[PDB]
A paper describes a structure:
Classical Zn2+-dependent deac(et)ylases play fundamental regulatory roles in life and are well characterized in eukaryotes regarding their structures, substrates and physiological roles. All active site residues were conserved, as shown by the multiple sequence alignment and the structural alignment, suggesting a general acid/base catalytic mechanism for the bacterial enzymes as described for the eukaryotic counterparts.
We were able to solve two crystal structure for two Legionella enzymes of cluster 3, L. cherrii ApaH and L. pneumophila ApaH. Structurally, compared to the arginase-deacetylase core, LpApaH and LcApaH contain an additional pair of α-helices and the central parallel β-sheet is extended by a two-stranded antiparallel β-sheet. Notably, LcApaH and LpApaH are able to efficiently deacetylate several H3, H4, DLAT and p53-derived peptides either containing a positively charged, a negatively charged or a glycine residue at −1 position, showing a low degree of sequence specificity, which indicates that these enzymes are capable of deacylating substrates other than the previously proposed H3K14. In LcApaH and LpApaH the XGGY-motif is conserved (LcApaH: 388-EGGY−391/LpApaH: 391-EGGY−394). The RPP-motif is substituted by the motif 176-GLPSHH-181 (LcApaH)/176-GLPSHH-181 (LpApaH), however, with highly similar main-chain traces. The structures show an open active site entry due to absence of oligomer formation and, as a consequence, the missing in trans supply of the active site lid as observed for cluster 1 and cluster 4 enzymes.
Numbering used by the authors: 26 to 418
The structure:
Amino acid sequence: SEECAIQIPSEIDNEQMQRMPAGGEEDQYLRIKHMSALIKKYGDLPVITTQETRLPYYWLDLFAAIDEGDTPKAHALFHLLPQDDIILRALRAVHSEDYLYQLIKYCIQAKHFGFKQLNADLVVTPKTFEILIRDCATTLFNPAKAHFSFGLPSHHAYTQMGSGFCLINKTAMLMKQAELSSAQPPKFVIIGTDVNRDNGLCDILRHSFSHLSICHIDVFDSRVYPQQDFAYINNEFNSEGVDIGKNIHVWHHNNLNYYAVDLSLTSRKSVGVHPALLFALEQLKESIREAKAKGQKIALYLPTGWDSHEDETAYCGKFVNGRMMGKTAAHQFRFNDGDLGYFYESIFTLYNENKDCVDTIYWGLEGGYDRTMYERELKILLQVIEKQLLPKD
Ligand SMILES: [K+]
Ligand SMILES: [Zn+2]
């Protein structure tokens, strides 16, 4: 089926992720491997693997150069890649050439100890670069209208540095290939439910994409990583984001709209789906109607983390002002399978009922670190897909 796919790294690609930090107790290798074993075992889903997609020669040669250690050969070989190759045009539409040099540089500089530690949250192996790109390849090179991909995370990656387990911003590049693959740019909408703020992806959209039409609903808790609240955004947009509702502000910069759903200020009303994701759906219910009666299409991007679950034990989702948040507060500020299952079910319903307006869906794995929590949430996620987005058997 070209209509939907589910993307995991291959054996080799996943294997070259050891020592790569996660905000949990396991490295990113175990973490992603566990999810992949589950996804392969859950019967028959349309599952694609980063080993089968072969890149053009010049990519395979930049890779090869990285392996033998010639930092000037790699630096040069990459500089001379075709400016119109599908990967690279999107890659350098969001990432500075100096960052990519420094990165290639780190991968090779890493080959000694098998790993090069940049800062507390950023490690690279020799093959980090090959995988980051072999990942970005397969998503770019595959015509799936509803893409769920399980790889290394992205919404903290900046146009110019890496931060917090993120090395490049695969989401923004995927938006790049959408502005250019379409005749008229699609109306963009992002909903990122990872409990840590999409600080990175946000900077890249203010900087390089403010002219595209993007509605970006960013759900996070200004109390965990990275401690940034509305005052911090004000200094970022050097404007003052107006309050639209449940202590949630919006900023406009040219054609980009950024909504900050802060989970501290937005607490839940006894029973019913968490107000944070009800606004996420009120705004995606509307963005669909706007683009219908205007005729344009919509590309829908879900950079989703599960550390926003109440059942997350990772420090970066649960250590709130000096102590670990507890089961009472956790249920008033985080999400439970009730909330999530409703959300995913609603999202796909809007899609199925508006395949004339909603165009592509891309869901990409950000946070969610506790093993028994994320394995349960995944089973939920796979079951809603098996029901809504797959032809029945
Ligand atoms: K987020
Ligand atoms: Zn996160």
